[PDB]
């Protein structure tokens, strides 16, 4: 592409051609036109999946949830126009977004009725049916996770950044474990690096050693970050990554901090958190050899709103590791309260 | 960090914040540590046994060429019999085993030309006889903390205090976005693409270095052998899976004597390459046009992959190391006399 960059201290510019990686996190994904492979094709795929034994869909990220929301109406209309007793019901997303073992098939022949595009304006809202194909919601009771399909779409072309472009998707033929690399952008320039996608924005810096600086996550996806989109992949232990490999954290020396290990039991149930290295308001952390061992993550404030003041760690490094969610400060697994017993404090109940 | 960009294929425009990597492959006025510390460093180096300087890149050569007059002015007005003469740069730029020493104190006097002296401190040039490479310094500077930026036009280097073999990371930028990637610095521009697997697409070089590309600035550094990298690691090629192409190995005997190269996977004009099971083995690279101007036309390779590897020198169109003629003997063609 071609682009220009700007300096505001001295008002002027720099232009050229190259690769540009934008901060596309915290932007509304629902202002695009989504084109999954085809209405007839996708209807046949859903029909065959229901006949095989797949009950529903577990969404990889929020973008697929929005896609299914945009598509469900026409999908049900096309299914009804063919005399198939099946309805698609779309729910809500809660974190972390766990994985399913099934995959969505690729039909040989599509259904022989309906229109040949998405966005056919005017169709008769369809009728409810006793058989339901549930996209992920609060429905892990009618069908378990082991019968749900996961990570079954491939992005073919997209225009994210322009709020009325079209997104083209396709049902893949293969079993895969990695995140879709069409929306990943990684860049390093001097002493700063970024690993990013549509939901992650992870920053790094060069102090005495390369280390993590701050992360901003609006979702907790459980795919695998592809190695072709990672800087400094070799010679790194899986036990030292701040963001676990099971949560689509890149396997790199840029995902490390001195004195901390992998945060398996952090507050991943949050809808959105932000990882940063400093103390929380009205708290102090001291390095003490008599402090307790690492365990699940704890919240700085009590369930009654009382702030705990004195914390400790055995061999961590200052500033401490904290997660800033909507509730408030949480602390890393290495930091425990110095005086008050842990039974008076709320803890994370999830593990990656 | 704030800027706008356009995609002319789709004809769409957007703006925002992010990290931008520009193609820079002149506008800089360089500032070493000082005009009074560099002189003391050169004085101590001469009195220590270091007879000259071997450049790392064209950046350093331009710096020395720009600062030589002033450096001689101070070094002569301060009472030292020593003159710095800087020559041109020949490729490839080989390493040296010595390093410049950091002075304890500056020269007391300093802030009109000088006269030629009998003592010569030769910077990179055609003077390999009064100063052999065994007694030359190499990779002895670092760009300072905030010495470089998108909007800088004036780069501030400092004399290094340690021994390193790696290139300066302050001027390196790599990025990947979807199905396109780039590893670049002030002298390289190396591109990659995703067809069925990641592979090298094209590379534009205006200098051949011998430092080492840092692993912190490289994508996909694991599970790769040095025998597969097209641009050899000895020539500051990245230890990356983006530096590979199926059917080819490391090009140790390419035309690295050149002055500005351009790698692309396309046949030279008026030539044909056929994959033949009865073709000669690999060795030094050959040029399509003979020294008399005749163009060779028929070429073969044992198990290479079409399209073939070629180097677009300023004076010709060379082939990869695996591609050989069928009929014409290679004793009469032009070959590369350098190796990595």
């Amino acid at each position, epitope marked *: 592409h071609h682009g220009c960059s700007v300096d505001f201290s001295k008002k002027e510019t720099r232009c050229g051609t190259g690769v540009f990686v934008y901060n596309d996190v915290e932007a509304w994904r629902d202002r695009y036109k989504y084109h999954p492979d085809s209405p007839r094709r996708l209807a046949a795929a859903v029909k065959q999946a229901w006949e095989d*034994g797949i009950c529903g869909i577990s969404s990889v990220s929020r973008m697929e949830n929005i896609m299914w929301r945009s598509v469900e109406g026409e999908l049900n209309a096309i299914l009804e126009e063919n005399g198939v007793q099946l309805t698609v019901v779309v729910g809500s997303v809660k974190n972390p977004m766990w994985r399913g*073992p*099934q*995959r969505l098939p690729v039909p040989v022949n599509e259904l022989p009725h309906g229109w040949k595009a998405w966005g056919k304006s005017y169709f008769v809202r369809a009728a409810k049916t006793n058989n339901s194909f549930v996209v992920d919601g609060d429905t892990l009771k009618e069908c378990p*996770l*082991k019968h749900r399909a996961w990570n079954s779409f491939l992005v073919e072309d997209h225009g994210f950044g322009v709020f009325h472009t079209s997104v083209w998707l396709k049902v893949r*033929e*293969d*079993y*895969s*474990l*990695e995140c879709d*690399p069409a929306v990943i952008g990684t860049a390093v320039k001097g002493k700063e690096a970024v690993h990013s996608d549509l939901g992650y924005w992870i920053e790094s810096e060069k102090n005495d050693t390369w280390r993590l600086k701050r992360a901003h996550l609006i979702e907790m996806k459980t795919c695998e970050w*592809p*190695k*072709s989109h990672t800087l400094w992949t070799d010679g790194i232990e899986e036990s030292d990554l701040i963001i676990p490999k*099971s949560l689509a954290g890149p396997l790199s020396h840029h995902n490390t901090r001195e004195g901390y290990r992998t945060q398996m039991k952090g507050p991943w149930h949050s809808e959105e958190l932000e990882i940063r290295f400093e103390e929380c308001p009205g708290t102090k952390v001291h390095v003490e050899e008599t402090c307790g061992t690492r365990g699940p993550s704890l919240r700085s404030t009590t369930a009654s709103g009382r702030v705990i003041e004195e914390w400790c760690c055995r061999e961590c490094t200052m500033p401490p590791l904290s997660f800033r969610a909507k509730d408030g400060c949480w602390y890393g697994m290495e930091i425990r309260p110095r005086k008050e017993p842990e039974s008076n404090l709320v803890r994370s109940m999830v593990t990656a | 960090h704030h800027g706008c960009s356009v995609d002319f294929s789709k004809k769409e425009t957007r703006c925002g914040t992010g990290v931008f990597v520009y193609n820079d492959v002149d506008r800089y006025k360089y500032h070493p540590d000082s005009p009074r510390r560099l002189a003391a460093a050169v004085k101590q180096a001469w009195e220590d046994g270091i007879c000259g300087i071997s450049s790392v890149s064209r950046m350093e050569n331009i710096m020395w060429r720009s600062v030589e007059g002033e450096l001689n002015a101070i070094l002569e007005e301060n009472g030292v019999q020593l003159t710095v003469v800087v020559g041109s740069v020949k490729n490839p730029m080989w390493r040296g085993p010595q390093r410049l020493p950091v002075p304890v104190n500056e020269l007391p006097h300093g802030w009109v030309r000088a006269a030629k002296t009998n003592n010569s401190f030769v910077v990179d040039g055609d003077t390999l006889k009064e100063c052999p490479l065994k007694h030359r310094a190499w990779n002895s500077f670092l760009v300072e903390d905030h010495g470089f930026g998108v909007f800088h036009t004036s780069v501030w280097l400092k004399v290094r205090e340690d021994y390193s073999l790696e290139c300066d990371p302050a001027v390196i930028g790599t990025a990947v976005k979807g199905k396109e990637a780039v590893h670049s610095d002030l002298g390289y521009w190396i591109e990659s693409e995703k067809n*069925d*697997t*990641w592979r090298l697409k094209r590379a534009h070089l205006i200098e051949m270095k011998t430092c080492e590309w840092p692993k912190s600035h490289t994508l996909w550094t694991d*599970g790769i052998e040095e025998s597969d990298l097209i641009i050899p690691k000895s020539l500051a090629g990245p230890l990356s*899976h983006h530096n590979t192409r*199926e*059917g080819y190995r490391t090009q140790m005997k390419g035309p690295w004597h050149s002055e500005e190269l351009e790698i692309r996977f396309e046949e030279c004009p008026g030539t044909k390459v056929h994959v033949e099971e009865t073709c000669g083995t690999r060795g030094p690279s050959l040029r399509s046009t003979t020294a008399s101007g005749r163009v060779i036309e028929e070429w073969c390779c044992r198990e290479c*992959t079409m399209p073939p590897l070629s180097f677009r020198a300023k004076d010709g169109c060379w082939y990869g190391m695996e591609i050989r003629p069928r009929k014409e003997p290679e004793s009469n063609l032009v070959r590369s006399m350098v190796t990595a």
Partner: antibody
Amino acid sequence: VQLVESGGGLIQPGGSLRLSCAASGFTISSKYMSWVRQAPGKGLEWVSIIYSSGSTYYADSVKGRFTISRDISKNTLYLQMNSLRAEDTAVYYCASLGSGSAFGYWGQGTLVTVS
Amino acid sequence: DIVMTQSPSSVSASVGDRVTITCRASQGISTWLAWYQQKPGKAPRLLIYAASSLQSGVPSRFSGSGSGTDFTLTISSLQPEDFATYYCQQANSFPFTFGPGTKVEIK
């Protein structure tokens, strides 16, 4: 589909040997292909995997000595073994990850003896 | 480093009988376990994946159930074709690890 193994055999300790697994009916680059060995008189053991994108992982037994490869022009899988020891004698299979994360298609198996 | 254990070590059964085999895990995997059948001199054959699903092409008489740490494999109507060795392997995280194996004999 079909998977056919290749030239395992006799080799002295400290020697090197290279296997192959030719694919038919599908593209080798669209599957997750693994190597599994079974010592004679023992149970199965997983050795190395290569992803559909090219990412490779290994087991701690053969971490620095084996190398799993892949050639798309000839559509076959590869395994380079170096510094073979006495406990490397087994039958080697090539398999594919289908669903769940279980191996669906298996080859016939090829024997390797180190002595 | 996840150790998979099986019980019993060998089962003797008659044709038409009901057979049950169990797997045990060192940690919690809870969905990611698959069952294989190997006759002597031949490659193993996948029967069940995701701890309950039936691989296409195998008879319906094989059933799998369980989660967490305890998993079981059942056979409804034993056949002369069903005398072989059976393995369980966790598919949760690398490295993938199999079980010791349990073999079914004629009684």
